[PDB]
């Protein structure tokens, strides 16, 4: 499996696009609510401020976190290799098989 | 081929005397079509989203 650092990096990226999807959804609801606000019912007027504020705060911190990720790219620089040992490990397992062949009491 | 072209010549006609009659209705009905455009704007944006 990959080293953990890459794991939380990909988790943060996934959070980033989920936040972008949430921003698009909230844009959909604010566009929806503005229609009836133009229609002329004032009951949903208080919800408009909350929706706008949450939309803007969702737009800002997502870009901020992505900026942090791109910054991490800046200092992460400088921080078949398996083949060099690959034959060796193959060697090992083959002899292990011979051991299983060599002992008739373990072939069950 | 239809005709030798000299067709359009400049001419003068006076502007019609204004009143309350037609501008207020023109602008409120423009308000109407733009409220329409807002409605289809919201609908198209909702469908796209």
Swiss-Prot record, chain A:
Function: Component of the Mediator complex, a coactivator involved in the regulated transcription of nearly all RNA polymerase II-dependent genes. Mediator functions as a bridge to convey information from gene-specific regulatory proteins to the basal RNA polymerase II transcription machinery. The Mediator complex, having a compact conformation in its free form, is recruited to promoters by direct interactions with regulatory proteins and serves for the assembly of a functional pre-initiation complex (PIC) with RNA polymerase II and the general transcription factors.
Protein name: Mediator of RNA polymerase II transcription subunit 11
Mutagenesis or variant effect for residue 85 to S: Impairs interaction with SRB4/MED17
Pfam families (UniProt xref): Med11 (PF10280)
Gene: MED11
Coiled coil: 56-100
Keyword Nucleus on entry: yes
Gene Ontology BP annotations: negative regulation of transcription by RNA polymerase II; positive regulation of transcription by RNA polymerase II; positive regulation of transcription elongation by RNA polymerase II; positive regulation of transcription initiation by RNA polymerase II; RNA polymerase II preinitiation complex assembly
Compartment(s): Nucleus
Molecular-function GO terms, alphabetical: TFIIH-class transcription factor complex binding; transcription coactivator activity
Organism: Saccharomyces cerevisiae (strain ATCC 204508 / S288c)
Any single GO CC term annotated in Swiss-Prot or TrEMBL for this entry: nucleus
Effect of residue 24 to K: Results in a decrease of TFIIK and RNA polymerase II occupancies at active promoters
Similarity field: Belongs to the mediator complex subunit 11 family.
Curated annotation (Swiss-Prot), chain B:
Entry's localization field: Nucleus
Coiled coil: none
Role summary: Component of the Mediator complex, a coactivator involved in the regulated transcription of nearly all RNA polymerase II-dependent genes. Mediator functions as a bridge to convey information from gene-specific regulatory proteins to the basal RNA polymerase II transcription machinery. The Mediator complex, having a compact conformation in its free form, is recruited to promoters by direct interactions with regulatory proteins and serves for the assembly of a functional preinitiation complex with RNA polymerase II and the general transcription factors.
Protein family according to the UniProt entry: Belongs to the Mediator complex subunit 17 family.
Assembly mode: Component of the Mediator complex, which is composed of at least 21 subunits that form three structurally distinct submodules. The Mediator head module contains MED6, MED8, MED11, SRB4/MED17, SRB5/MED18, ROX3/MED19, SRB2/MED20 and SRB6/MED22, the middle module contains MED1, MED4, NUT1/MED5, MED7, CSE2/MED9, NUT2/MED10, SRB7/MED21 and SOH1/MED31, and the tail module contains MED2, PGD1/MED3, RGR1/MED14, GAL11/MED15 and SIN4/MED16. The head and the middle modules interact directly with RNA polymerase II, whereas the elongated tail module interacts with gene-specific regulatory proteins.
Other facts: Present with 1720 molecules/cell in log phase SD medium.
Name assigned to this protein: Mediator of RNA polymerase II transcription subunit 17
Gene: SRB4
Full-sequence range covered: 247 to 295 of 687
